[PDB]
């Protein structure tokens, strides 16, 4: 909350990443760029445990 009021105070470089997302309802919803990182990290860490 406190941080939200500081951004309002100082509107200098307003936070991007606008909520357009992927959407499409069904048949591959988002599953795309922040989540890709989480998928890639998960793969490696699954391998790590077996190796």
């Amino acid at each position: 909350a406190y941080y939200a009021e500081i951004m309002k105070d100082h509107q200098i470089e307003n936070k991007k990443k606008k909520e357009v997302d992927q959407d499409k309802k069904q048949d591959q919803s988002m599953y795309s760029t922040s989540f890709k990182r989480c998928c890639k990290i998960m793969e490696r860490m699954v391998v790590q445990n077996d190796q």
Partner: protein, 106 residues
Amino acid sequence: KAVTDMDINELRKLMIGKAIINSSDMQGDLLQEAQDVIQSGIENNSAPVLNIEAACKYIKENLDKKFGPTWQCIIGEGYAYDVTVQNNTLLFMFYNGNLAVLIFKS
């Protein structure tokens, strides 16, 4: 610079006299009265180190004389509560950094 330069330890240090309201079940005019009294109240008896008992001795007595007889006020770093209150008798405003102020009238 701006938000990127600003770290938590810089943000807290930069500004202590900021004010931020979360909830507000109480009426618009009665908040203006209480908000001024609690801010001035805590800073007075903040002392060398913040006496959390001392803060809520002052706020309790002030809000008993100002409005009604059975007024209950608790402040803390962090906590969970469920509290049955009368209609338009409750304000929840936290002070900057690590101070959460719940005031209500039972």
